[PDB]
Ligand binder design. Structure first.
Ligand SMILES: [Ca+2]
Length: 464
């Protein structure tokens, strides 16, 4: 408390923060005197990127609720201890290396706490004990490596917790001294967990066993090579699972068997070379499966069977076998939901494209986008595709870039696309072995194509 009109300057030693208080109170100068009543009138401060090193003085602002200090140079935050009305707090992008146990002992009304992009290395026990109303905690982009069992104890109303771009990996290795640290114990309301970008190479079963309420788990960009059976056993409410960008080489059978609400599974960028049958048996809600950038070849009949709600399937960048193309096509004759199908950079060839035309020729195909970039397709894969382009009325996008289509192949497609049942909006035929003469004839005849918004003919550079 102050009891005399005092210059801002005298209360807030940091020239930059004084200027913040001046602005915040609408005074012309830091030399202007303030009263306690005026300091009591401050319930919100927005001071991101203000070149602040020091919030000394803020102690005298008993009523602050919303405090935004992102982008400054704060290392200490003692001055905040007792601002008990704080509900929203942004301290991201400062120079905080360390936090005392108990700095938030008194911040009982805090609901949102952003601590991202600092240089925290560890956190003492119960550093958030008394934040019972806290629902969002962001600790991404720190250097965190050292947490105990109970660093997140007391946080029983937490709904979002972001730990991305830290270095927690060693804490979850089995040989780690004491065993792995199960620091998600009790987090019963947690709905959103982002654990991407640590160096995680093991994942103990039971790290998530209490997360009854989880909807989104992000494990992207770690070093994982396998998942223990039942590491998701009790994540029953889960809708989004992101396992992209790991080293996954095998999945156990029924790692996801208890995840019936799952709508989105990102398995992209790994080294999966196989998938056990049944792995997708109980995912009847799943609408997006992304398996791109992996080393797939063969797959059991009915790895995709139960996925009758599936809507986008991405198998780009694999070495899919002609067999697998028949399963996919199989799915489409039955599912009648699959809309996007990405098969880029696979050796499909005529053999696969024919298999895939079978479905497209089936009245019940809902397929809207097909991408067969660089699929090693021929001019006679196009006789077969053309067949469908006349019929498959739901088909709107077709990408055949970087294939050896040639002119006789392209012509097939123009006679098809000029046909009454063509509803195609987009055609990509870049690098398909075409002349300008070709490309110009193509462009011209497709101006008559009623549905065609979009047409690419690049990397086809020969004049006659
Ligand atoms: Ca000063």
């Amino acid at each position: 408390t102050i009891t005399v009109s005092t210059p801002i300057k005298q209360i807030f030693p940091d020239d930059a923060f004084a200027e913040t208080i001046k602005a915040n109170l609408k005074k012309k100068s830091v030399t202007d005197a303030v009263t306690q009543n005026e300091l009591n009138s401050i319930d919100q401060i927005i001071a991101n990127n203000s070149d602040i090193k020091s919030v000394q003085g803020i102690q005298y602002l008993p009523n602050v609720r919303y405090l935004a200090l992102g982008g400054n140079k704060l290392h200490d935050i003692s001055a905040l201890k007792e601002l008990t009305n704080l509900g929203w707090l942004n301290l991201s992008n400062n120079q905080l290396e360390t936090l005392p146990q108990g700095v938030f002992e008194k911040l009982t009304n805090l609901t949102t706490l952003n601590l991202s992009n600092n240089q925290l290395t560890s956190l003492p026990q119960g550093v958030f004990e008394r934040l019972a109303s806290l629902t969002t905690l962001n600790l991404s982009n720190n250097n965190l490596a050292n947490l105990n069992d109970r660093v997140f104890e007391g946080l029983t109303n937490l709904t979002t917790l972001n730990l991305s771009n830290n270095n927690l990996a060693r804490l979850w290795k089995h040989a780690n001294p004491g065993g792995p640290i199960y620091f998600l114990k009790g987090l019963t309301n947690l709905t959103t967990l982002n654990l991407s970008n640590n160096g995680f190479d093991e994942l103990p079963k039971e790290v998530f066993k209490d997360l009854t309420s989880l909807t989104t788990l992000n494990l992207s960009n770690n070093q994982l090579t396998s998942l223990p059976q039942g590491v998701f056993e009790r994540l029953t409410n889960l809708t989004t699972l992101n396992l992209s960008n790991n080293q996954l080489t095998s999945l156990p059978q029924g790692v996801f068997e208890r995840l019936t609400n799952l709508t989105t599974l990102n398995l992209s960028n790994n080294q999966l070379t196989s998938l056990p049958q049944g792995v997708f048996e109980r995912l009847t809600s799943l609408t997006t499966l992304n398996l791109s950038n992996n080393q797939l070849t063969s797959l059991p009949k009915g790895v995709l069977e139960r996925l009758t709600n599936l809507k986008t399937l991405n198998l780009s960048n694999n070495q899919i076998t002609k067999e697998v193309c028949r399963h996919v096509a199989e799915l489409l004759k039955q599912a009648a939901s699959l809309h996007e199908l990405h098969l880029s950079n696979n050796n499909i060839g005529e053999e696969g494209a024919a298999e895939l035309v079978e479905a497209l020729l089936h009245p019940g195909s809902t397929l809207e986008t097909l991408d067969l970039s660089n699929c090693n397709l021929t001019k006679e894969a196009c006789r077969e595709i053309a067949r469908a382009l006349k019929q498959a009325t739901t088909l709107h996008e077709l990408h055949l870039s970087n294939n050896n289509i040639g002119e006789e192949g392209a012509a097939e497609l123009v006679e098809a696309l000029l046909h009454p049942g063509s509803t195609l909006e987009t055609l990509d035929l870049s690098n398909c072995n075409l002349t300008k003469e070709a490309c110009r004839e193509i462009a011209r005849a497709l101006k008559q194509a009623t549905s065609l918004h979009e047409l690419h003919l690049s990397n086809n550079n020969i004049g006659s």
